[PDB]
Write an enzyme that holds these catalytic residues in place. Structure first.
Site, PDB file in Angstrom:
ATOM      1  N   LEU A  24       5.712   0.436  -1.052  1.00  0.00           N
ATOM      2  CA  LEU A  24       6.316  -0.844  -1.508  1.00  0.00           C
ATOM      3  C   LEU A  24       7.820  -0.667  -1.664  1.00  0.00           C
ATOM      4  O   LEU A  24       8.322   0.302  -2.279  1.00  0.00           O
ATOM      5  CB  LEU A  24       5.548  -1.161  -2.785  1.00  0.00           C
ATOM      6  CG  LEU A  24       4.380  -2.086  -2.883  1.00  0.00           C
ATOM      7  CD1 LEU A  24       3.567  -2.329  -1.657  1.00  0.00           C
ATOM      8  CD2 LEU A  24       3.496  -1.560  -4.038  1.00  0.00           C
ATOM      9  N   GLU A  31       3.771  -6.249 -12.193  1.00  0.00           N
ATOM     10  CA  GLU A  31       3.033  -6.694 -10.982  1.00  0.00           C
ATOM     11  C   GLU A  31       1.814  -5.789 -10.847  1.00  0.00           C
ATOM     12  O   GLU A  31       0.693  -6.316 -10.638  1.00  0.00           O
ATOM     13  CB  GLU A  31       3.867  -6.817  -9.761  1.00  0.00           C
ATOM     14  CG  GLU A  31       3.410  -7.592  -8.535  1.00  0.00           C
ATOM     15  CD  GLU A  31       2.075  -7.305  -7.893  1.00  0.00           C
ATOM     16  OE1 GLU A  31       1.903  -6.101  -7.568  1.00  0.00           O
ATOM     17  OE2 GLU A  31       1.237  -8.174  -7.739  1.00  0.00           O
TER      18      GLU A  31
HETATM   19  N1  LIG Z   1       2.548  -5.547  -0.439  1.00  0.00           N
HETATM   20  C1  LIG Z   1       1.258  -5.317  -0.697  1.00  0.00           C
HETATM   21  O1  LIG Z   1       0.519  -5.934  -1.443  1.00  0.00           O
HETATM   22  C2  LIG Z   1       0.618  -4.104   0.067  1.00  0.00           C
HETATM   23  C3  LIG Z   1       1.357  -3.404   0.964  1.00  0.00           C
HETATM   24  N2  LIG Z   1       0.826  -2.334   1.638  1.00  0.00           N
HETATM   25  C4  LIG Z   1       1.652  -1.613   2.628  1.00  0.00           C
HETATM   26  O2  LIG Z   1       1.020  -1.705   3.936  1.00  0.00           O
HETATM   27  C5  LIG Z   1       1.478  -0.547   4.712  1.00  0.00           C
HETATM   28  C6  LIG Z   1       0.314   0.088   5.404  1.00  0.00           C
HETATM   29  O3  LIG Z   1      -0.324  -0.904   6.244  1.00  0.00           O
HETATM   30  P1  LIG Z   1      -0.992  -0.421   7.613  1.00  0.00           P
HETATM   31  O4  LIG Z   1      -0.198   0.588   8.326  1.00  0.00           O
HETATM   32  O5  LIG Z   1      -1.257  -1.560   8.483  1.00  0.00           O
HETATM   33  O6  LIG Z   1      -2.343   0.295   7.141  1.00  0.00           O
HETATM   34  P2  LIG Z   1      -3.736   0.211   6.532  1.00  0.00           P
HETATM   35  O7  LIG Z   1      -3.693   0.494   5.059  1.00  0.00           O
HETATM   36  O8  LIG Z   1      -4.454  -1.015   6.804  1.00  0.00           O
HETATM   37  O9  LIG Z   1      -4.451   1.462   7.224  1.00  0.00           O
HETATM   38  C7  LIG Z   1      -4.570   1.443   8.668  1.00  0.00           C
HETATM   39  C8  LIG Z   1      -5.743   2.341   9.024  1.00  0.00           C
HETATM   40  O10 LIG Z   1      -6.944   1.888   8.374  1.00  0.00           O
HETATM   41  C9  LIG Z   1      -7.964   1.900   9.303  1.00  0.00           C
HETATM   42  N3  LIG Z   1      -8.285   0.551   9.582  1.00  0.00           N
HETATM   43  C10 LIG Z   1      -7.599  -0.582   9.139  1.00  0.00           C
HETATM   44  N4  LIG Z   1      -8.145  -1.705   9.561  1.00  0.00           N
HETATM   45  C11 LIG Z   1      -9.244  -1.266  10.270  1.00  0.00           C
HETATM   46  C12 LIG Z   1     -10.276  -1.998  10.893  1.00  0.00           C
HETATM   47  N5  LIG Z   1     -10.295  -3.329  10.898  1.00  0.00           N
HETATM   48  N6  LIG Z   1     -11.214  -1.282  11.535  1.00  0.00           N
HETATM   49  C13 LIG Z   1     -11.163   0.081  11.485  1.00  0.00           C
HETATM   50  N7  LIG Z   1     -10.294   0.842  10.907  1.00  0.00           N
HETATM   51  C14 LIG Z   1      -9.335   0.090  10.306  1.00  0.00           C
HETATM   52  C15 LIG Z   1      -7.572   2.822  10.452  1.00  0.00           C
HETATM   53  O11 LIG Z   1      -7.911   4.165   9.972  1.00  0.00           O
HETATM   54  P3  LIG Z   1      -7.946   5.481  10.978  1.00  0.00           P
HETATM   55  O12 LIG Z   1      -6.636   5.332  11.766  1.00  0.00           O
HETATM   56  O13 LIG Z   1      -8.064   6.640  10.123  1.00  0.00           O
HETATM   57  O14 LIG Z   1      -9.141   5.243  11.821  1.00  0.00           O
HETATM   58  C16 LIG Z   1      -6.072   2.396  10.550  1.00  0.00           C
HETATM   59  O15 LIG Z   1      -5.081   3.234  11.161  1.00  0.00           O
HETATM   60  C17 LIG Z   1       2.272   0.347   3.757  1.00  0.00           C
HETATM   61  O16 LIG Z   1       3.695   0.090   3.930  1.00  0.00           O
HETATM   62  C18 LIG Z   1       1.763  -0.135   2.403  1.00  0.00           C
HETATM   63  O17 LIG Z   1       2.706   0.162   1.348  1.00  0.00           O
HETATM   64  C19 LIG Z   1      -0.518  -1.965   1.427  1.00  0.00           C
HETATM   65  C20 LIG Z   1      -1.167  -2.703   0.529  1.00  0.00           C
HETATM   66  C21 LIG Z   1      -0.718  -3.809  -0.218  1.00  0.00           C
HETATM   67  C1  LIG Z   2      -2.006   0.224  -7.745  1.00  0.00           C
HETATM   68  O1  LIG Z   2      -0.868   0.749  -7.053  1.00  0.00           O
HETATM   69  C2  LIG Z   2      -0.741   0.140  -5.802  1.00  0.00           C
HETATM   70  C3  LIG Z   2      -1.403  -1.046  -5.447  1.00  0.00           C
HETATM   71  C4  LIG Z   2      -1.172  -1.575  -4.150  1.00  0.00           C
HETATM   72  C5  LIG Z   2      -1.878  -2.841  -3.659  1.00  0.00           C
HETATM   73  C6  LIG Z   2      -1.485  -4.191  -4.278  1.00  0.00           C
HETATM   74  C7  LIG Z   2      -0.534  -4.260  -5.265  1.00  0.00           C
HETATM   75  N1  LIG Z   2      -0.225  -5.443  -5.808  1.00  0.00           N
HETATM   76  C8  LIG Z   2      -0.811  -6.492  -5.308  1.00  0.00           C
HETATM   77  N2  LIG Z   2      -0.564  -7.719  -5.850  1.00  0.00           N
HETATM   78  N3  LIG Z   2      -1.727  -6.547  -4.313  1.00  0.00           N
HETATM   79  C9  LIG Z   2      -2.049  -5.359  -3.791  1.00  0.00           C
HETATM   80  N4  LIG Z   2      -2.986  -5.295  -2.820  1.00  0.00           N
HETATM   81  C10 LIG Z   2      -0.344  -0.920  -3.246  1.00  0.00           C
HETATM   82  C11 LIG Z   2       0.316   0.259  -3.606  1.00  0.00           C
HETATM   83  O2  LIG Z   2       1.175   0.903  -2.753  1.00  0.00           O
HETATM   84  C12 LIG Z   2       1.095   0.583  -1.384  1.00  0.00           C
HETATM   85  C13 LIG Z   2       0.110   0.771  -4.901  1.00  0.00           C
HETATM   86  O3  LIG Z   2       0.741   1.961  -5.320  1.00  0.00           O
HETATM   87  C14 LIG Z   2       1.237   1.733  -6.600  1.00  0.00           C
END
Ligand SMILES: NC(=O)C1=CN([C@@H]2O[C@H](COP(=O)(O)OP(=O)(O)OC[C@H]3O[C@@H](n4cnc5c(N)ncnc54)[C@H](OP(=O)(O)O)[C@@H]3O)[C@@H](O)[C@H]2O)C=CC1
Ligand SMILES: COc1cc(Cc2cnc(N)nc2N)cc(OC)c1OC
Length: 205
Positions: A24, A31
């Site tokens: 993030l 949050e």
């Molecule tokens: N702002 C927010 O609320 C959030 C932000 N984020 C951010 O998102 C980013 C990561 O996103 P991203 O790279 O897309 O990764 P993901 O967390 O979705 O992980 C991707 C991996 O998960 C697996 N995967 C995901 N979808 C599928 C599917 N439909 N079928 C099979 N396997 C699947 C695969 O694993 P494998 O390759 O091992 O097979 C793939 O490479 C980070 O920057 C993180 O901080 C994450 C969560 C919340």
């Molecule tokens: C609980 O800590 C984390 C949580 C999340 C996911 C997440 C965080 N906040 C919101 N509103 N939606 C989400 N899916 C994402 C994170 O990093 C990618 C975190 O590391 C702190």
């Protein structure tokens, strides 16, 4: 494979950016406590028996501070094809979203002392893309961050924009509080220079 609806939870900028450098781009204490509260809540009556489920992509799993892993008081599932050697003391792995749902329905039947309440998809962009296509996804808990922070990963469907306005509807705040079972701050919060706000969007299946 079926039963319950899916809920997506995400924190995003007005430009739909969701992360940068596998993290993030913001440090927002309140949050994360909101996140925690929402994904953990189960009604008191149901509290002995039931827990919530959190579904995440492998790279999100890798992104969570080792300290925070696994997500306490929640059944955690990691979606990975390259499951190969997951590492978890009873954290499950599944090869897709639907495979995850069949696993939980098998593991947590009417035998089980542990029953499932709500299922949340908590990221990342790849998994969000799969959940937005899923016929059981009906609700989005969004945190809107009112800054154009530089991101390299974007949310895949512009659900808040005009082209999706006959499908996705924003709910009134009082409906938000009812669904999450607690008072939630109405309007803008300021923390570390970011203004942000809590929203709930739904669609008809
Ligand atoms: N702002 C927010 O609320 C959030 C932000 N984020 C951010 O998102 C980013 C990561 O996103 P991203 O790279 O897309 O990764 P993901 O967390 O979705 O992980 C991707 C991996 O998960 C697996 N995967 C995901 N979808 C599928 C599917 N439909 N079928 C099979 N396997 C699947 C695969 O694993 P494998 O390759 O091992 O097979 C793939 O490479 C980070 O920057 C993180 O901080 C994450 C969560 C919340
Ligand atoms: C609980 O800590 C984390 C949580 C999340 C996911 C997440 C965080 N906040 C919101 N509103 N939606 C989400 N899916 C994402 C994170 O990093 C990618 C975190 O590391 C702190």
């Amino acid at each position: 494979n079926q039963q319950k609806s899916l809920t997506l939870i995400v924190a995003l900028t007005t430009s739909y950016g969701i992360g940068r450098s596998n993290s993030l781009p913001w440090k927002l204490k309140k949050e994360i406590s909101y996140f925690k509260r929402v994904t953990s809540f189960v009604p008191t009556f149901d509290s002995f028996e039931s827990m919530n489920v959190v579904l995440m992509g492998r790279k999100t799993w890798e992104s969570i501070p080792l300290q925070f892993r696994p997500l306490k008081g929640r059944i955690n599932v990691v979606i990975t094809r390259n499951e190969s050697l997951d590492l978890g003391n009873g954290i499950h792995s599944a090869k897709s979203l639907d495979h995850a749902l069949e696993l939980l329905y098998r593991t947590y039947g009417s035998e089980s002392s542990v029953q499932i309440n709500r299922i949340f998809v908590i990221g990342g962009a790849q998994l969000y893309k799969a959940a937005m296509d899923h016929p059981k996804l009906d609700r989005i808990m969004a945190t809107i961050i009112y800054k154009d922070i530089h991101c390299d990963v974007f949310f895949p469907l512009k659900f808040r924009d005009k082209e999706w306005s006959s499908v996705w509807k924003k709910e009134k705040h009082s409906d938000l509080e009812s669904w999450v079972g607690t008072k939630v701050p109405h309007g803008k919060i300021n923390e570390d220079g970011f203004d942000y706000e809590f929203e709930m969007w739904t669609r008809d299946l």
